[PDB]
Structures are given as structure tokens and as C-alpha cells.
Amino acid sequence: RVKIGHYVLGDTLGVGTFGKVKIGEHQLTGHKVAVKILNRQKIRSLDVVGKIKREIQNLKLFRHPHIIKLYQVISTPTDFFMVMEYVSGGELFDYICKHGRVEEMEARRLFQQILSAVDYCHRHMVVHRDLKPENVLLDAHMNAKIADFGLSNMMSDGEFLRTSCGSPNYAAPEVISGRLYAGPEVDIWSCGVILYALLCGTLPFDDEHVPTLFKKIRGGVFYIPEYLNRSVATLLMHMLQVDPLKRATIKDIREHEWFKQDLPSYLFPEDPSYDIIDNRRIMNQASEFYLASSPLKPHPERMPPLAVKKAKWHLGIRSQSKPYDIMAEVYRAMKQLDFEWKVVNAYHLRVRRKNPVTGNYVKMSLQLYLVDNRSYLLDFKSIDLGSHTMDFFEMCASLITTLA
Amino acid sequence: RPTVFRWTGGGKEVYLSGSFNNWSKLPLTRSHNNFVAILDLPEGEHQYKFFVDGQWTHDPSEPIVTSQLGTVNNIIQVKKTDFEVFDALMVDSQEPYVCPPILPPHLLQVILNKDTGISCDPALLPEPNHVMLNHLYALSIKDGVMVLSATHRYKKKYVTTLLYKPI
Amino acid sequence: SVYTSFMKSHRCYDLIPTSSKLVVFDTSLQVKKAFFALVTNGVRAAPLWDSKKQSFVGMLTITDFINILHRYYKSALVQIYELEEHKIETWREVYPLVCISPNASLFDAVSSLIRNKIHRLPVIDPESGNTLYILTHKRILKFLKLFITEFPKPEFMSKSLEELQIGTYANIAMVRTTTPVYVALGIFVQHRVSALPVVDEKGRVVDIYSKFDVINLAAEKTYNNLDVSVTKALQHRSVLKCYLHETLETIINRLVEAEVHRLVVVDENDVVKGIVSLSDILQALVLT
Ligand SMILES: Cc1ccc(Oc2nc3cc(-c4ccc5c(ccn5C)c4)c(Cl)cc3[nH]2)cc1C(=O)O
Ligand SMILES: Nc1ncnc2c1ncn2[C@@H]1O[C@H](COP(=O)(O)O)[C@@H](O)[C@H]1O
Ligand SMILES: Nc1ncnc2c1ncn2[C@@H]1O[C@H](COP(=O)(O)O)[C@@H](O)[C@H]1O
Ligand SMILES: Nc1ncnc2c1ncn2[C@@H]1O[C@H](COP(=O)(O)O)[C@@H](O)[C@H]1O
To answer: What would changing residue 163 to D do, according to UniProt (chain A)?
Structure first.
């Protein structure tokens, strides 16, 4: 029979977004594991050879009670065997189908466990973009287990994500529109419908016609049944908000009264049961000492108004001319300043200048965006003896000055 | 040191013959369409060939070799870097003068345009979004002086510097 | 005792807030604009960046705003041309940068603040060359306050101020209730103190005039009339004190709660007797 490192492979548990997953059983003890199989040739045929490396390096360091643990990964001349935790409960999707809906007493607990897993990912700069009841597994004691990352990705500082991925449902409006997104707010949107599916037993946005389905999602209009109380209803409307800036965050959800009730204190980092260590708790519980508040006793060093109207900061620089004219303009602007640069995109330059005083190289990233209708915006981003932040500002200043 | 031998073709019964079996027939296990067998092979080259429904055959999508007599068998090269995951992912893997996506709404959240409540140190700011970092924000030029600003990260802290620079 | 070993352990990085704002002025910037920018950005002081030599050269504080006014102020009938015309670069000619690494100890910070007799210390990362934060006495003491229950009680905290002899109790620089602002600025320059107790004819402290109350002249643009009384200048906001028998801990708690830099040591009534400053406290908790 088929043996892979003391484990006998069995029936296919299913096929994920990338790879075949089949149960394994220990030859000596009968211990069950789940083995995802990745074909090295199909990995190298695509440009995902470096994408798999990242996922392995990140899934191996994960240790959350509600995320499928990775035990080890075996390497063969043709295939990769990722041996990971097995759970016999099956999908959550099949659970919502067995029962009619889910009792809010139990639905809340499952939602608390899921969101705990999501938050852990976001704190490790990982965004799981394929959140769905089919990807939430159950064990013998009804504990949620997030799995099948595949479409997941990392989050860099000052970087947006492009890929439109995931199921047609459960997908944020920005994802189905092919727009740039931050990451975390997308997962919250999937958790919103998951909760809806958990409570209602159906989907908030559903249609046989796919173009009509996208219309409903972008519209952000869904039916809220009367058996859903006032409290939980306000939470769903917050999580499924179309405009990602108005959409709730995990901190928002954690402050919601429907979410706080019957909430175990071991699930979240700053809850009493979660926790040098003593030093951080002293510093963390001093929020007003490390972070600013938002609109008592006026701070002694508060400045009076100079009353003149306060000036408003804006993102980079703008224009109302042709996109080609702007790029043609910024190109001749780099000539007068002697800038060396590589072209990544028709609207994405990676420029670089050598500092004549320190000798160090100063590089930054340029990106032209589209605002409103007849508007454009040039974005300035920094790239990692004097001072790097000053180098970035001085380099930007010279380019802005010699640019109309 | 396991090695996977998978038969993707059709058949009711598939056997595996190679130098390891002294060219004897090893019964393969069937799933739905897959006939596979995992063996323990040392480093080097190994000649193998399948046996399907009473007929010798090989995998077309695999390296083959002729033994000067017409017999054609497959070739697999078990390397030492095939048994380490990251060593396997490694082997599997300007200055021109030239020659628009919708602006993401997160970048419109200017951190210097929001009040912080007259109760804390005026130097304090809210915790920034990781996606707005390294981006340049500026003021309108007034009387020859340009003011630039950006939020950068040091360790787990964040600093929003402002540069008043006359042009 | 253990407070000294405490500050030798923690780095300066531990004091830097999670998200803060740092204003920077180029040296070729007009000095009047910079003072206005301190007001509009809510910031008390800013590092100075010399664009030519590509390095930070110093700080611009309200003390500079005092020096400028006092040096060139003829009358309320004539404008201060130099305040209107000078650049930060040019005024630094008429009138060495002291900084500290974020990896440096908290003990080195307090020492550097005292040795150089400064009130605000730039925390500069030697790796990137970037400036991260500006250390002050208030920030340091309020930090130690967060650990007085974690590193429990030395013996002197229970001792009175008269016993510990902490603070200045001789030649206290004060101003009358009707003292002109120009005169007050002259005392700031001559004696180099951060605040001046305002007393009445009876001899009681009716108010206090800190160096911080000077930028209000730049805010309200009333700086061209320094003939007005010190009471008139403090009208826009119209006094924390202590006794000689009160314990050091009570005084430290008094300071960190009010977030001010000094307390006025009074007698039985409201008449002065001395001054206990934050620089006096940090000095006593380092020379032990
Ligand atoms: C979706 C997909 C994922 C992966 C893939 O590549 C591999 N499939 C594999 C199947 C097996 C396999 C085959 C039969 C088996 C077992 C255990 C018992 N039986 C009876 C495992 C193995 Cl040992 C390695 C594989 N590598 C091929 C496909 C595909 O396109 O079909
Ligand atoms: N870190 C520093 N490096 C150099 N000079 C300083 C520093 N801090 C303060 N000064 C000078 O000391 C003056 C008084 O400011 P302060 O120290 O805030 O009372 C300032 O106007 C500066 O000229
Ligand atoms: N109004 C004042 N008159 C005399 N000395 C003072 C006055 N204010 C502060 N001092 C002293 O000046 C030193 C530095 O205080 P500060 O300028 O507040 O850091 C300390 O020794 C204080 O006691
Ligand atoms: N002992 C005190 N009593 C009342 N107000 C004070 C005292 N010390 C400082 N202030 C005020 O606190 C603000 C900041 O001054 P400083 O503490 O010098 O930074 C100014 O408005 C001062 O007038």
C-alpha cells in the first residue's frame, strides 16, 4: 500500500485551490493526518514557486487553536507532501446544511473562534482571501478550524493587493471589481456573509446570473430577517458595508455587545486570560501615553490657534491633463535632475538618484492613479551618513518643483 | 527517502518494473484514475517502466532511454536536493530614459488632518494604517515654502515627520 | 538605588510613543515662519536640518523666540525687521548638536540632559540617520512613574523635601504682577530659568509665567508690543505648589499628574521659599 513517512495514504478528503488533500493513517498507531499533495512540475510551470515558499515559511510558524496546524512537510523528487492536522467534523458548510440554521448561542461561539483565527493572520501580515464555510473545518468538539490558504498573501508596508480571487459570493465588492485593496477589510467582508450564512442559513447576495450577482454585491443591499435581533443586525450591516472605509474592523467587532457576550478570554491578545511580559502590559495599559485619543482637561502644551483657517494636507500631486502627457512630462523632469530608473508599468516608475554628499543611493516609487472622472494623481512612495527620510523628501521636492 | 511513481494513464491493472525490482512486476494501488506506488530509492539514476493490461509501456511525459535493442524505459534522477523542501524550491525556481488604476480610498485618510482631542500630548498621533506608510503627503505652497510629510516605521513604532523646506 | 539600575536597563526606545509627530525645519527657512509653524503644528520645538551639509545641526525652541525678541525690540512703534527678515541659518550666526541613540540607555538620557543643561533631547537613529522623537524631562519621569510599583520603594521617597534638600532655595527669579513682558524676557535670558513666579504687592504668587507662555505672543501676533504687563500676557488663560514637609513621592505624583515641569515651594501662606523643578528631581535620582 501507499506509505509516505510512516503514514498510509487513503481516500481523497477533497481538492483545494492548490493541491489534492487525502487522509493519512499511522501504520503503527492509527493516528490520522491530512496530507495535501503538491506537484513540483505544476508548481514550476506557474510562477508560484516563490509563492509556495512564502506560505510554507508562514504556515509552519503559525500556532493558533483555530487554524489547521502544519506538522511537517516531506519533499520528494516529484511531489510535496504537507502533513497537517486532521479533523473529523467536516466542513462548516455541511453543518449549516444538516441543521436548518445555527442557534445564536452556538453561532456566536463559532464566529468568535473564526474571527480569532482571522485576527491572528492579520497580526502576522497574512490575509486569507478565501474565507467561506467550506473552508472552515470542525473537530469532534465543534471547534472552527480555518484551512486552505492558497489564495492567501502577505501584506507589505505601503503596498496594496491586486488579485481578484475567491468565490463569487463571500467576495468583497472591491475584489469583484478588480480594484486595489488593503487586505484585512476584505476578510472582514467574508466573515460578514459567513455570519449571515451562519444565522440565516442562506446567502445575503445570491443569484443564478453571475453579472446580476455582482450587481447585488456592489449594491450592498441584502435582506435582514425579523428573527435577527436589533443588536446582531447592526453588526452585520457594519461588516458588510460597501465602502471599505466605513466597513468595520476587528477592533470594531470586538467592541460590539453581541460579540462581547459569552466571549472566552483566551481568544484575544489583550483579554485578561491571554498572557518583559509584565513590562509590555504596563506599557499597553497606558494608551494615552503611547497613542492619541479622538474628539476634559486641556493638555498644558496645547497650542492656541494662529483665527486663520487650518491648511489641509493632500496626497502627492494632481493633474487634469492626458495620462500620456503627465508621463511624458515626468520623464523630461528626470532628465534635468539626472534620475536613473526602470519601468515596471506604464504608470509605475522605480526611480533612483545618487546623493552627491553622502554617496548613498536614494530610490523611490512613482505611481499614477485615477481620481473621480477627469482627474489624476501622482503618488510618491519611499523605498528601503545623512538621513533617509530627509533624502526622500529632498528628492521629492526637486521633482515636484521642476514639474509645472 | 521516498520516491513517487504515479501512472496517470488508463487501465484495469498496472504494474511497475525497474532496476529495483530486477524488472519484476510490482502491483500498484488504485484510487479513482491514479495508479501509484511510493518506494525508497537512493541517490542516482533509476530506469523504470510500467505494465498495463498485459502490455509494456512508458510515460510519454518522462525522460526515456533506449538500451540499444529497442526496449524503451523511463529515466528518473533522484537528487540529494529532492528531499529538502527549500532546497527543492530553489532548484525549481535598467537605467533607461523611456518611452491607470483607480486610487485606493485608504490613501485619502490623511493622518495630519484629524484632531486628537485636547487631552493628550500634541505630538501624539493615531496608529496609522500599514498601507499608508512611506507615502508622501504635502501642503499647498505659500510664500515660497513647500511642506512635505510622510509616516515611516521604526521597529514597532511610527513617526510622522514634517519638513518645512523653502524652494 | 534601584531606580538608577532601572534606567541603565531600559533603552530610550521604550519611551518613544507608538505613533507621533515630528516637525522639522530647514535652516534656510525664514525664522518667523518657523515660529508660526510651531504654533500651527502644536509642537514646542523642532530639529534643524542643514540641506547643504546634509545633517541635523540643532533644535529650534521657544527659548530662541525669547532671545530674538529681547535682542531686537526697539518699540511698539517700529517693527522688528530682523524677526521679519532673518533666516534660521542667519540668526544662528548672530547668536554642537546634542543627541542620543534609541538603543542608548535611559540613564544616558538623563545624564546628557543635565551635562549639557538642555530640556529637550533629539533621539536620532544612527542606522538610518533619521530623527525619531524628542526626549524631555516630563516624558522620562512619567515613564518611571509607570514602574514605581514594579520596582518597589527606595527609602528616600518617604522623606520630606526639607530633609532631602532638593531644589533651589536661594535667589529665586520672580516678576511683579505689573512687570512688562520685555523685562520678563530679559530675566529669562539672564538667569536661564524655565518659569517665573508672578507675585503681587503683598508677596503672594498670583500666577506663573513659563517660557511656554511666550509663543502665545506669536499665536495672537501680539509680539510687537512687549510693553504690556506680564498679567496682560496671561489674560488669555486666566498655581501648583508644595510644602517643605511633604514627601518626595507626593511631590513626584503632583508633577506627573499636572504634567508641568516645576512646583513652587511655598511657606505657611502663598509667599515663595524656593522652587522644585523636574531637572532637580531627575538629578537627585541619578547622583545616587
Ligand atoms: C488536483 C491535483 C493535485 C495534485 C496532483 O499531483 C499528484 N497527485 C497525486 C496523487 C497521489 C496518490 C495517488 C493514488 C493514491 C494515493 C494514496 C492512495 N492512493 C490509491 C496518492 C500521489 Cl502519491 C502523488 C500525487 N501528486 C495532481 C492533481 C490532478 O490534476 O489530478
Ligand atoms: N539637543 C540640543 N542640541 C543643541 N542645542 C540645543 C539642544 N537642545 C537645546 N539646545 C539649545 O538650547 C536652547 C534652549 O532651549 P531649551 O534647552 O529647550 O531650554 C535652544 O534654543 C537651543 O539653542
Ligand atoms: N524662578 C526661578 N528662580 C530661580 N531658580 C529657578 C527658577 N526656576 C527654576 N530654577 C532652578 O533652575 C534649575 C533648572 O530648572 P528648569 O529650568 O526648570 O529645568 C533648577 O535648579 C531650578 O531649581
Ligand atoms: N507650578 C505651576 N502652576 C501653574 N501652572 C504651571 C506651573 N508650571 C507650569 N505651568 C503651566 O504649564 C504650562 C507648560 O509650562 P511648562 O511646565 O514650563 O512646560 C504653561 O501654561 C505654564 O504656565
So the answer is: Phosphomimetic mutant
